Design a protein around this ligand. Structure first.
Ligand SMILES: Cc1cc2nc3c(=O)[nH]c(=O)nc-3n(C[C@H](O)[C@H](O)[C@H](O)COP(=O)(O)OP(=O)(O)OC[C@H]3O[C@@H](n4cnc5c(N)ncnc54)[C@H](O)[C@@H]3O)c2cc1C
Length: 449
């Protein structure tokens, strides 16, 4: 219990009814600080707690691979919350209008949401505060250290965020207390109608066969815990020296569960720190789930233009601009990149892996984004192409981790200058020849036709 995890958004008259919790980024019952604080505030106010989720109108911007994954977990979440006397209300529409009408017609006392630094989340918040008179608070239930408490500014490098975050670990890395219980439309409805609207835009093969394969990642809080415990007892020892070999999938595979909030990163760290494994293989894992993951929330929180050329460091903007008029080797289009029609079979295999599984390997995701810059008309055209492709097919898309990693590959955010070659400038270059020495490229290409 720490009061630094909750920040007030608007102060008003405390109502006389139930505490409404606005679930957005953390779709789980266990290990949800925003859910725990909702009950704690409800208990001291002699009022029940209720959880609300808003299905936004932006779902038609992505495929069904993300729609079915999150909705299937919501079906498990509704039953898991019913076992704790907490009613889950699933609304469909704009949050600025659905939540404003829900608070008034339900007599809410205190309305709480979870933290998300993305622009669209701030878009809803601005409209919510314009239609409520009750207190409005938000809780960071996605980061071990609150994003505003870790650093009060945009950190420039990973080696500068590591001392600040690791110093605040003993105050914020704590066990999760139990969520004690209190004292309309079925989800199968919207899942059927939603899929029907996304079917014409589903990615297919030549024989009218859908490209997505949904047997790689089962959604749900239950399946998320099995993936964590399996990775620790079978892959944690080999994560250090095999995280960059996509031929062996020696990764946690938590990104679909982590992005949708189906599992807490603080719970994952607790189980890893209390697991006797290789010393080097462990330190490399927390470096990604603590430093690199929570620096992405830091990137989107303190940079309003996180998806634009303006958020690049000064040295990268000067480097890339001096190479805007350099002759590009090739200029593929959005339709070419989407179906993997480039002359680089390592890039095609990376794009084919994303279409068929919905989760590209960590190493190949850097090579995939940097070649987009090398084959684009302008750096700004690469940002849009990389964002549209990542957010449409990645199960972990539409996440601060994506915009930060896209800014890392194209603009060198949280990176330094390198050799100065044409087009890419001083940005870190990843050659096909350098990839042949790191791992078996012939194995990765043959794994995806
Ligand atoms: C251009 C680009 C786009 C990306 N798009 C996304 C995205 O939209 N959403 C997303 O969650 N990840 C994205 N990744 C970040 C990273 O690739 C993924 O976190 C990782 O691939 C997820 O698969 P994993 O859980 O099996 O990896 P693991 O090796 O198991 O990492 C464990 C966790 O640490 C975090 N993590 C790992 N690597 C990074 C990293 N480089 N930066 C920040 N956090 C990290 C992830 O949360 C990850 O779940 C992107 C990376 C790049 C370079």
């Amino acid at each position: 219990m720490n009061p630094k995890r909750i920040r007030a958004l608007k102060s008003g008259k405390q109502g006389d009814g139930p505490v409404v919790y606005w679930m957005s980024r953390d779709q789980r019952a266990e290990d949800n600080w925003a859910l725990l604080f909702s009950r704690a505030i409800a208990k001291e106010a002699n009022v029940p707690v209720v959880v609300v989720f808003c299905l936004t109108d932006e779902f038609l911007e992505a495929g069904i691979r993300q729609y079915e994954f999150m909705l299937k977990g919501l079906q498990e979440l509704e039953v898991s919350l019913s076992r704790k006397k907490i009613p889950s209300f699933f609304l469909r529409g704009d949050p600025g209008e659905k939540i404003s009408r829900f608070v008034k017609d339900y007599n809410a006392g205190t309305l709480v949401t979870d933290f998300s630094p993305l622009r669209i989340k701030n878009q809803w918040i601005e409209k919510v505060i314009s239609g409520i008179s009750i207190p409005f608070f938000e809780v960071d239930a996605h980061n071990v250290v609150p994003c505003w408490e870790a650093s009060q500014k945009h950190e420039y490098a990973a080696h500068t965020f590591r001392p600040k975050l690791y110093a605040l670990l003993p105050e914020f890395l704590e066990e999760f207390p139990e969520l004690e219980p209190n004292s309309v439309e079925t989800l199968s409805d919207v899942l059927e109608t939603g899929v029907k609207a996304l079917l014409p835009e589903r990615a297919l093969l030549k024989n009218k066969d859908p490209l997505f394969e949904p047997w790689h990642f089962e959604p749900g809080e239950k399946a998320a815990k099995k993936v964590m415990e399996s990775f620790i007892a079978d892959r944690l020892d080999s994560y250090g020296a095999l995280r960059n070999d996509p031929t062996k999938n020696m990764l946690s595979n938590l990104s679909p569960y982590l992005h949708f909030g189906q599992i807490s990163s603080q719970r994952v760290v607790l189980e890893v720190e209390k697991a006797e494994s290789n010393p080097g293989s462990k330190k490399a894992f927390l470096d990604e789930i603590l430093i690199w993951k929570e620096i992405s929330d830091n990137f989107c929180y303190y940079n309003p233009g996180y998806d634009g050329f303006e958020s690049f460091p000064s040295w990268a903007k000067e480097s890339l601009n001096a190479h805007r008029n350099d002759v590009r080797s090739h200029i593929y289009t959005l339709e070419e990149f989407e179906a993997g029609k480039t002359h680089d079979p390592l890039w095609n295999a990376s794009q084919m892996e994303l279409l068929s599984t919905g989760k590209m390997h960590g190493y190949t995701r850097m090579y995939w984004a940097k070649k987009i810059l090398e084959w684009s008309e302008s750096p700004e055209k690469a940002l849009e192409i990389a964002i549209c492709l990542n957010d449409r097919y990645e199960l972990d898309g539409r996440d601060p981790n994506g915009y930060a990693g896209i800014a890392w590959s194209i603009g060198g955010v949280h990176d330094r200058a390198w050799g100065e070659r044409e087009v890419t400038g001083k940005i870190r270059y990843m050659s096909y020849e350098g990839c042949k020495r790191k791992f078996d490229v012939k194995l990765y290409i043959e794994k995806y036709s």
